[PDB]
Design a protein around this ligand. Structure first.
Ligand code: CA
Ligand code: CA
Ligand code: K
Ligand code: MG
Ligand code: MG
Ligand code: MG
Ligand code: MG
Ligand code: MG
Ligand code: MG
Ligand code: MG
Ligand code: MG
Ligand code: MG
Ligand code: MG
Ligand code: MG
Ligand code: MG
Ligand code: MG
Ligand code: MG
Ligand code: MG
Ligand code: MG
Ligand code: MG
Ligand code: MG
Ligand code: MG
Ligand code: MG
Ligand code: MG
Ligand code: MG
Ligand code: MG
Ligand code: MG
Ligand code: MG
Ligand code: MG
Ligand code: NA
Lengths: 157, 162, 160, 158
């Protein structure tokens, strides 16, 4: 019935972002600028309310010193960007349940995407899948093949 | 080369865990007990200093008694049926004392939902678009297909138990 | 040939822990959480099945009135921990015999370890050993027990 | 406020069957032992007298007829399996749980050299090391010597 208000996501990000993309301390003015952009507000409302929108990215960018943030639905890489991605666990974010129990969180660094994805596949997805299953064998093998593929791309820079 | 002290990871977890595995508030007593276990101190120390240990899992479990909450910290990444977890993966072989801890870790949450669904969601909603976003701007198109096959495979696995 | 299932050990601890580490009553929820950890299941399985693992420790810790349990193979002291140590009598715990006949049990308190050990040596080990030998290296071992007892007594006295 | 003898009896009625029997209720043999006059006096002493440190509950079999006996004296018997209780403080207080005030050690019918070797090697030595890692080195070495002494005594009769 009740979709969470945008302010619930803003408040959550003011607390979470400083822990994951900064060295602690309070939410920087730069992050507050991003949370208040009209575009950002509409992207965040869409994420909260629309079952077809699954993700939101908080991206911290530096230029040569100068820190900037941006909020958008699109999950992507940037050479001088470090990001936090939120994935909804259910189609809509319920105003009546805690927000943290409705999201999955992943961080995405400025490393080569081949390295970052290799690391997530090799160190998290592969053992988590094996832990459960120990078509399933065919999916275990595809995880292994994806891991190798990514390792090759990473080695071939 | 100076390795970060285990207190650096404890302090970080005290702040982060409540935002990700609880509904905010202070670090619960159950978490502090898990952070002070001798076994956990050992596991955390290996994570900080041993290039061969890539990961650490903070696992929050619930038991029916009304619910009893327990935490446990260990290197092994696994699923639990009434467990919601935070996994840390190191970006480099050792965690350096002289840089912020948050800059040296990758974080992923792992819920109590069916792992087929959890993994489908990470592959479909993060791994796929992150990869495609990068290659758009020769193994590469074959890895893109492999991600699509993995995605579909996890989708079918979930569908089969719904 | 048949190794006892981890559930045999869980059941035994559910009954025993409340009498030795609590004031009776039912197995606390804190103990049940410790008993179902994956790390704990693996440690307990290794204790039951592997000749090179001799012990398992059930450790009760207090924080701040907040009680936590943890199960692990390693025998150690903790400043606000009271523990129950099980030592196997044989290399492998046999499924076909009662579990209690296959274990030795020792409790290890939150007291200074000098005092705890002094007490076990002077009140149990010494008189047990003497009872047996009285009923060529044996007098030499008796002397070693007395030296150890003395040494532990002095270590405790030094921090009093 | 010193503990009454019934506090120790009740505790033994619950503990003994877990440690010296295969569970079940306290056998009549244990109840007979807890009501002997000699046992009652010894238990009373244990509770109240600073110079009595220990009490043993000893389970004996005769070819199987089961017998129990409670006495202060800690000793081995070839047909006996025992539970030893050691007081942590000079007297046992009624106002605190009795379990918090005792140390417990089981003592089996195995060769005493083997039982003692096992306690020293698997409990005392790592417990002491864990502490002195977090005169002490001389005691660590005496532990190792005792361990070795017991090992050799057991090997010699194998
Ligand atoms: Ca912007
Ligand atoms: Ca634990
Ligand atoms: K924008
Ligand atoms: Mg700023
Ligand atoms: Mg960039
Ligand atoms: Mg949806
Ligand atoms: Mg708590
Ligand atoms: Mg501990
Ligand atoms: Mg739960
Ligand atoms: Mg783990
Ligand atoms: Mg600093
Ligand atoms: Mg991170
Ligand atoms: Mg992933
Ligand atoms: Mg299907
Ligand atoms: Mg069994
Ligand atoms: Mg409890
Ligand atoms: Mg061992
Ligand atoms: Mg305590
Ligand atoms: Mg062995
Ligand atoms: Mg065996
Ligand atoms: Mg001390
Ligand atoms: Mg001993
Ligand atoms: Mg009674
Ligand atoms: Mg005394
Ligand atoms: Mg006697
Ligand atoms: Mg040893
Ligand atoms: Mg030693
Ligand atoms: Mg020697
Ligand atoms: Mg010899
Ligand atoms: Na008698």
């Amino acid at each position: 019935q009740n979709v969470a208000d945008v302010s619930v996501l803003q408040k959550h990000l003011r607390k979470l972002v400083p822990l994951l993309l900064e060295d602690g301390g309070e939410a920087p003015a730069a992050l507050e600028a991003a949370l208040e952009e009209k575009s950002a507000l509409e992207q965040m409302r869409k994420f909260l309310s629309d079952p077809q929108v699954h993700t939101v990215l908080v991206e911290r960018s530096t230029l040569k010193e100068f820190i900037s943030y941006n909020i958008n639905i699109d999950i992507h890489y940037g050479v001088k960007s470090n990001s936090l991605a939120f994935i909804k666990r259910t189609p809509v974010i319920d105003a009546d349940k805690p927000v943290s129990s409705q999201l999955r969180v992943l961080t995405l660094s400025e490393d080569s995407p081949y390295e970052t994805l290799h690391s997530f596949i090799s160190n998290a997805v592969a053992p988590f899948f094996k832990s459960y299953i120990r078509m399933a064998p065919s999916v275990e093998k595809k995880i292994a093949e994806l891991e190798m593929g990514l390792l090759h791309l990473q080695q071939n820079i």
